[PDB]
Assembly symmetry: D2
């Protein structure tokens, strides 16, 4: 009689379980931790509030935390990213999960609140796992008494880390955090290669458009922008890249992309006349990858080629000025998470109007909204890091420290390189790769231990 | 003017035409000329330089001189000099001691000619090095000269490693800048430079078709990354070996099969540990590690007949070429290309089919069999060098009190703003347009509109 | 729209509005096909044409169908594969009053019945006079079972490599009853659709079916013809380590030069019928096998026994017998993951352990995987193919082969391709659709290379 | 020993050439397989071959294969810049008449061809022709018709030469039958495409050492050479745009991921400067012509190109670029052999530091051979195995000995049978270590072929 959940359709659970069993075989680092630590139960007593895309991959993460002794209460960190068969499988396993694909904003907030509260009162949570910082922010704003008893936060993504560092700077961060994003087996695996796999995946599922031979503009060339640019270029798109960071721009040039700005001489002065109309009028697809605000603005949207596709693979939808489009233009749903936006006016549209843009996932994270996000074998790396980070902060027991010791430990840190390398080694073995062992003479010659770490902490890979 | 030694001074005109072309290819470096020419920040600098005497290094030398410095120059590899570049620098009245095809003895004599002027130590006060040979010679043989030197600017990964060993040991005598670790150096030069010049050098040396053939790249750091791409983009079936599992993960995700020369990755010294089936299929092996003996004697014995062997790390001991000198017969095809006959040591059959082709005698192949990295890539590295020389020369470490020196003795990188400024000029050289943040957008992501745009931890 | 319309069978008529929205988008992606619509609508060149059509009932086929109709034709339609229909496309066509018998997930019995519903109208043979076919199944049923209907049919326009091969065999054996146009071997079909179509849709289908990471894993592509070329690129551009098998040494040479290792499932390339001739070390490291040959049993039972545990098996050739799925049905237990995705447990026939590690993943039960697990080729690629189909239909219909005296009939009983000038005109509209700008020869340049300024620009022997 | 019947740059380079020939033999398994297969039979015994083709190391292996099969030859290069002097020396030192060096003048080029045609001042007793581009063929038809009476056939290497043969056939002026070697698939779709992929960026790097990644290229043409050339530059990271007059080839360029553009506004070349897309050409760092056509990089295009752009041609003849206009109007500064700065400031003198120049490679002649070494041995293996088979076939057919009525029936331009094309391909695949699968009899029956091939109808395009 388990009822402590809310999902779209519990009868999807058997299908979700079939897919979890497949995913397990694709996630050797994560399942390796499950097998290594199951006897020790290092998360016995852990009670984790989790807020991250309720995908099949997150399913394997949840069940690893539980297998290691944790209890959890779970929600998605995006209204469109849940895979309903994954949510159902977790619910059918007796795990509290409040998530479905296609939440409203009110429902999204209600789902987070159902993890925070059990039977109408604060759950006895003592750990947080977050992706983007929304759960973290709600706890700090609305539930400070709960944070007194929480040992730490493990944060998945660049945007969430930025929010933690802002709190730390302001003196408002209440518990320590591990930045999971900046393991190399996360940032330079998930953020880059994950988007390489899943960006063109989501565009094909949403539109079935041919991409080869067409013009793309990728805004940003960080890890997500690098992977996104490659996702499109490997399909044969002619890809131009915009950047504010000249070092990232240099990389894009050297990687074989033309670097362009939407604005004449790069000057974003807010006028229509600043838009490079010739450029925007040639673009068939624009993808935002920045984690910034309004990088595909109203004037770019007005100047885009007729029937261009617009999408965002950064964490939040405000990378695109969808507010402007809702205020001024008529939306025609093609199918879920695919809308034609008719620039002919607000009050209705002609079904055969040629002047429209196609928006994917209403501007929300397109890989998760229009496909299934990153593949299991990539999320393996991220989620092995999550499990290790949860173990580290739970074993440190920050909430039980005296005030003077808390002050010494209140920080945002990354996992040590030795763990990063060990996660990587399990990923490489999963491909059947064979890593060479240094001889003692070689290890002495380059000044490392035979078992690693093999690089100083400054190394950029 | 007689204070030089080059292969042929009459190549000077040719070198100068190529220097004028290279200037148009090096916007960050020529921008530093224009920006600092007025200030003359290196007025009074006396720089001992040791780096491959290419056309690219010619534009670097003439930038340092244009900013006020005097220099005395040598190459840091016996095969890397471009004789027309050396001639052009000598003809400009700049002391340089460098030619393509030096012996080891001549290489050392060349460095010594920069150190000594008219039989006595030059009154040098700055060092620019690539690999650390000159740094080592000064510390071991001319330690008193270091009392007048304000700093060392070191170009490459191997050289930086040697600097850090001296720092850890308390034997480093002057402060240094790690130029290698600017992003516009390491992630431009070390990677993209090798992408351009590895296939270049293999083609010049052998003219082999690469498409459809099997390569093994040992190492997947920045040089191994660029090297693997150099070969894969030509259509080679590239396999990658690594000891670092993170780099190996990147190789897998980049589309390469990760393998070891040794069964289960365990190199126990026996022939039985060699994966003979793997090595018997390899047409080309490239070492990229900066380590020792990563293409060892047993691997060389097991390689497919007529495979090519080369090294693009800093030093030739990546391949056990000593073994091949001791046991096999060398037939020169042309300079820096040898067939190594595995049939025996004394003599060979001119039609023997059992040989390997070694490029540049195991020395840096891109510089040895071609011209190293192209001007537009070296632009980034050498703009960093100029900035680093200006900074250390202006800090005047050798004039500090003995106690003040202790606080200054460090190995530093340039600040990120300068890295970004080098990058900006590179981007402009491609016609690229960098976008400017709005104030609200800069606030939103927590940076200044001016940058730097990333924390120092960011890995790009 | 027509009142009382019931002359169709589809999965779900309420998908029609969705299908119509996708057809309107597809129209914007198919400039060559929509150019023919605009150019010829007033002329009504297919007025009086009654076309039996048998091709994958996709959105792209929907635009083809409504172009034929816009040019005057009546049609009766079925899919040429049990898994290739897009149900929203079928619904939109039925809602337009067009007879269509097609849904995703037909049985083999339903598949044949759907073709017969196009052939029959109100229990009697329709008065068809044109055939449009993809793979030869409708052609075969007419010759085998309704030969008298062929007396009134002016021609067949055949879409794909396998169908043309069957047509040529019939022509050689004297059993083909009407002329045909080989649409496949227009360059704007074969070297666009067969190659780039599979480039787009093979990795698409694998991702939708399995969501497996492809980068870093090992693939074996059987065949390196046009489909094999595009399939190999589909996987290599994702970062797979792709090996290629071929029987044709010229195709194998191209694979080597394209950067692939060429290998055989059999030691020394020789299948001796025994497990010992399988290169078990090779197959034990393959994560994904894709058949592309148009041939039979190229991924056979012994290969399937040797494949790496949890390998994906799929076929993108026209017919499922490229893979010995019958052996797998007979000996191994099938577990459906979801529609068109099955785990095949090699532990035995009678039941399976839900956590068994020794299974293969079969996509689309071995049927064409791009259409079965995704949506096949994109509109902008199918534009080229289907423009050729319209032009082929117009040509054969205007030729009126069935009205000729018997002597003239023998003179015209042929399998032909469209002239190169038409192939070029299709290509030009495709190029303009990308915004590309073709240069016009000066008169002196055209004289210099011996062509007209308006083309054609190559001799018929040119291979591109 | 007493051999003087040659002219090369430097005979002392022979030992070097011989070392490179021995390496090239290991890279040319199809050609060396033909040597082993046919050495005993001597199918070319009595053949006397006039050869005109780039005197490279690869051509050296071809020549010694012909000679090992019984032929005598007299050889010249088909381009003034394409000879490798060590290859020419190794061949002369072997006692084979060769007249070829890198850097010939036009007068020297013609003299070299005449030295193969004439021996001791009189027509050689030639009975076979091997040609690359048709210059030797044209001279024989115009100046030595009596020699063609005794010649059994021409085997022609390249697209341009085949076009010239077809023009002769059309006009009824071709005097002996020919094999079009170009259009074996193991030539056209190996040499023309993959050879240029290998050797174009090679030649640009040797001539300029320019970084290509991140820069803008314009490739004129997208036939086999244009396809391989565009890949050569794209694989280096150039942003490549493609021009074409053939919309099918342009379609392939689009689908291959290139933007298709014209130097002329709306593609209309009306001879005015106003017709030039100056904004486009002002952004191009590198232009490469691949067409076999005339004046596809014309004077107004040259005037509009971005300052310091590289201009080169990889089609057979230099008239793809209007270099005549550049010689008449602009000042040429040699950087080094086959690399010239063309200063657009004027004809009489230049400023050594002028920024407004173009860099022309190989004076507009075939750039892969002019600035590097042309295609690699393992690719030329396919082209030259076809050459050897075509020589064997035409010499055994003995056209010159046929009666007039039988000549009229055999006077044609033909390709080699597909079975031979396949046999060349299989040796190439074995050279890579590739393992082709053998059809079972049932599978061969299913697709309608013999187990041993041919596997495709003659219409198949690959
Ligand atoms: N969808 C996914 O699966 C997924 C995966 C990982 C991360 N993310 C999200 O993607 C976003 C980016 O993450 P990342 O790791 O790439 O971060 P990053 O900091 O490495 O890269 C962002 C880049 O955008 C550039 N940029 C910022 N403002 C710009 C502007 N106005 N114009 C052009 N370029 C601009 C920055 O210079 C930077 O290089 C974050 O919100 C992150 O949380 C999404
Ligand atoms: N030739 C050039 O132009 C050029 C340019 C830059 C640097 N370099 C030199 O190249 C070398 C590599 O420099 P880098 O910047 O790539 O350094 P790096 O540290 O980034 O990479 C070296 C890599 O080698 C790997 N490695 C070490 N021992 C190994 C072994 N036994 N087997 C396999 N992999 C092994 C390490 O794990 C590491 O990833 C250095 O010597 C450097 O000075 C040469
Ligand atoms: N799924 C799609 O969207 C799609 C699209 C076009 C064509 N097709 C179908 O795909 C198939 C192939 O079409 P194509 O145009 O590439 O044909 P093709 O003749 O160009 O290629 C088939 C290739 O398979 C090779 N082959 C045959 N038997 C082999 C064997 N035992 N082992 C290895 N290689 C072998 C042949 O040598 C040939 O090169 C046909 O059935 C065709 O109808 C499917
Ligand atoms: N350098 C080499 O090693 C090498 C190798 C093979 C062939 N070739 C030569 O290269 C040339 C091309 O050979 P190919 O086999 O590619 O021929 P091709 O007929 O396959 O291709 C030439 C292409 O040029 C295009 N074209 C013609 N005029 C044009 C114009 N004004 N603008 C744009 N495109 C135009 C044609 O449409 C055609 O597609 C010939 O001269 C041939 O002999 C050179
Ligand atoms: C008839 C014939 O001789 N065919 C052939 C083609 C290429 C190579 C070889 C032997 O290598 C043979
Ligand atoms: N061309 C070049 N000049 C100087 N140092 C280099 N290191 C690598 N390539 C170089
Ligand atoms: K997924
Ligand atoms: K589709
Ligand atoms: K060559």
């Amino acid at each position: 009689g388990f009822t402590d959940y809310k999902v779209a359709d519990i009868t999807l659970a058997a299908w979700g379980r079939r897919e979890l069993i497949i995913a397990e075989s694709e996630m050797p680092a994560l399942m390796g931790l499950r097998r290594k630590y199951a006897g020790q139960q290092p998360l016995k007593g852990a009670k984790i509030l989790g807020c991250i895309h309720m995908t099949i991959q997150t399913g394997v993460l949840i069940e690893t935390l539980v297998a290691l002794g944790a209890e959890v209460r779970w929600s998605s960190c995006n209204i469109f990213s849940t895979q309903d068969q994954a949510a159902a499988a977790i619910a059918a396993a007796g795990i509290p999960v409040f998530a479905w694909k296609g939440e409203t904003e009110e429902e999204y907030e209600w789902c987070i609140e159902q993890t925070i509260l059990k039977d109408g009162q604060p759950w006895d949570a003592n750990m947080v796992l977050d992706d983007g910082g929304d759960l973290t922010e709600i706890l700090h704003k609305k539930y400070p008494q709960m944070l007194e008893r929480i040992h730490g936060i493990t944060e998945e993504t660049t945007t969430g880390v930025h929010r933690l560092l802002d709190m730390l700077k302001n003196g408002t961060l209440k518990v320590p955090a591990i930045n999971v994003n900046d393991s190399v087996t996360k940032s330079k695996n998930d953020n880059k290669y994950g988007c390489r796999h899943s960006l063109n995946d989501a565009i094909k599922r949403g539109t079935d458009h041919l991409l080869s031979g067409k013009q793309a503009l990728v805004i940003g060339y960080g890890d997500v922008g690098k992977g996104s640019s490659q996702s499109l270029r490997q399909e044969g798109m002619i890809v131009k890249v915009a950047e504010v960071d000249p070092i990232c721009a240099m990389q894009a040039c050297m990687d074989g992309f033309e670097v362009v700005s939407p604005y004449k001489n790069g000057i974003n002065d807010g006028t229509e006349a600043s838009i490079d109309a010739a450029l925007l009028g040639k673009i068939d697809l624009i993808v935002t990858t920045t984690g910034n605000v309004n990088v595909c603005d109203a004037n770019m949207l007005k100047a885009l080629k007729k029937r261009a596709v617009v999408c965002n693979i950064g964490h939040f939808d405000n990378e695109i000025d969808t507010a402007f489009m809702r205020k001024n233009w008529a939306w025609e749903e093609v199918k879920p998470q695919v809308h034609k936006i008719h620039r002919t006016g607000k009050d209705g549209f002609d079904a055969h109007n040629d002047d429209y843009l196609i928006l994917l996932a209403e501007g929300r994270l397109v890989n998760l909204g229009n496909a299934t996000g990153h593949p299991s074998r990539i999320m393996d790396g991220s989620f092995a890091n999550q499990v290790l980070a949860q173990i580290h902060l739970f074993e440190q027991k920050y909430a039980d420290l005296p005030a003077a010791e808390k002050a010494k430990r209140l920080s945002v840190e990354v996992l040590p390189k030795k763990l990063d390398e060990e996660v990587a080694l399990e990923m490489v073995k999963g491909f059947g790769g064979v890593v060479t062992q240094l001889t003692p003479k070689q290890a002495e010659y380059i000044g490392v231990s035979v078992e690693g770490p093999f690089k100083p902490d400054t190394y950029r890979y």
